[PDB]
Structures are given as structure tokens and as C-alpha cells.
């Protein structure tokens, strides 16, 4: 119950951050919330990182980790993702 409401807030926070910021100069991937992580505006041909989402029940023990995603050279996001640093450490 509280997990999902915190997850809702994380998604709301992502929309707000995009609506109160602009992308960097040049070709850049559009910001997007993919139901797991909030992806910010990212320069083309780079691998983006954002902190492990603070809605995870185990966020405290992964708070210094990141999830990664590729921003293609065409300003388009990739479909692959590395969220190993955000896994539940049992």
C-alpha cells in the first residue's frame, strides 16, 4: 500500500522535473519515466545514469547505485538497461 503510493510520487516527481527543466544544448534524448526509473534529458551518444529510484523498499542499501541506459547518437533511447546496482541485496 505504501510502496505503490511512494512509487506514484516518484513518477509524479519525474513529470515535475521534466516540466520545470529544459534539455541541454544540442541533440538529446527526451526525458521519460518508464514505470521503473526517471530518465532525464541526456546528451546524444552517451550512457545515462540516474540514482536507484527512492521508491524501492531496499533503497537505503542501494542509495549510492545507479541504473544505466543508452542515449543513442540519434537522440533516441535504447531498450537495454543495467539496473544491477539497484537489486535487492537480500
Amino acid at each position, epitope marked *: 500500500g505504501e510502496l505503490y503510493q511512494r512509487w506514484e510520487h516518484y513518477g509524479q516527481e519525474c513529470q515535475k522535473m521534466l516540466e520545470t527543466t*529544459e534539455p541541454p544544448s544540442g541533440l538529446a534524448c527526451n526525458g521519460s519515466f518508464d514505470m521503473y526509473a526517471c530518465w532525464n534529458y541526456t546528451a546524444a551518444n552517451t550512457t545515462a545514469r540516474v540514482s536507484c529510484p527512492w521508491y524501492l523498499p531496499w533503497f537505503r542499501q542501494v542509495s549510492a547505485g545507479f541504473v544505466f541506459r543508452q542515449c543513442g547518437s540519434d537522440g533516441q533511447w535504447g531498450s537495454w538497461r543495467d539496473h544491477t546496482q539497484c537489486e535487492n541485496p537480500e
Partner: antibody
Amino acid sequence: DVQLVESGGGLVQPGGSRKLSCAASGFTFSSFGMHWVRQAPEKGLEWVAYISSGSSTIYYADTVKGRFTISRDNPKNTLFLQMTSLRSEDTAMYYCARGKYPTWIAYWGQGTLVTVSA
Amino acid sequence: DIVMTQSPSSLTVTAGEKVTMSCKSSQSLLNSGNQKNYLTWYQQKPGQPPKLLISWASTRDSGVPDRFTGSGSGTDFTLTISSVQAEDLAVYYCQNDYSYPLTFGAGTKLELKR
């Protein structure tokens, strides 16, 4: 620098209509959500309406919902506020505002004064 | 709707002294998820539009000097101005930035003893 220049204020008869405009420059207008905030003379600040960058989500204050319509023209870098069924209590200086994470409201325009009177 | 209550309604101080004003919300502005308080302060000079001072309770906007300090959490918040200057004459508003509708306090008017 960011600057918002409001326009369209003046005298409106009680129950009439009036459309305010807000010309923005110094930032990527199409990337920001925009607000209208008003201030009755000698009184405080009251948030009125918000429109997201793509006009996909919109919030209105209760005292305004049903009468005012917020809209924008991104290519022309312009925010609009269409007011209808105005009354004496709508008399205020009307500000348009842009956000700056982490806040919804950061930069304010000079404002335009709307007087509702017979 | 969250009601924002500011006190004092106004006060007067001489240049060089330090002032403190309070801002209270009828509901908590603390997001326990990210541990941030959604409280923002504005400074409105006479005859000017409001100016962003502090966001997320304590984060000064770029250009705002150190003598403006925001603090508090939950429902109790405070703005503190040290080495008050003549130009600090303004009405100081706090605003609920947590949820819509966004609501402002009635303001604290800072006047100067001369």
C-alpha cells in the same frame, strides 16, 4: 535571461470576458510548464492555473474552474489565459510564471492589471 | 487544500540586525520518499513581482546571498535574514509546493527602523 511580459489587462464589465497573453523569451518555452498567478490589490498571492509544456495536463484553482481556460502557443512562445464571467473579486494583478526544479514557480513576469467594474 | 499561515503579519527592524519569521502548513509538506520539504520562499519588493528566494525549504536559488536562510520540516518552517539591509524591504511569502492547488501564506512584511 528569462523574461515574461504579460499583456491584455484593463477594464472589464462584471460578467464579461478578457484574454491575457504572456510573451516568454530567454529559455526553451516549449519545454516548460507555465502558471498564472494573481494578486488582488494590497492582498496576497493566489495561484490560478497551470498548463504543462505539451498542454497535456492542466490544473485549475477552484475559484476559477469552469470560467477560465489556460492555453499556449509554443511556436509563438506565448501563454494565454481566457477569462469569462468575471466578477469584482477577479480584480487583480495577473502574473504568468515559469518553474525551475525543484519548484513549480520560480520566475515571474511584470504582471498586467485587470479591473472588473461597471 | 493546504492552508499556509505566516507570522508575524509584519515587523520592523533596523539595518544590521537579524530577523526571523515563521511559516506553518495545515498539512505536512515532507515527502518521506525523497526526504524533501516542498516549501518555497519568495521576496516581493514594493512595486515589483515576487522573486524566488529558497526552494525545498532550505535551498537558496542561484544569486541569493547566504544571509537568507530557510529551515524547518514537516509543518513548521522559518526564514531567517541576517545583516538586514535597506533593500531587504519587501513582503516575504511562503508557498505550498507539495500538491495542487499551490497555496501561499498571507506574507510577512519586513519594514525598516531608521
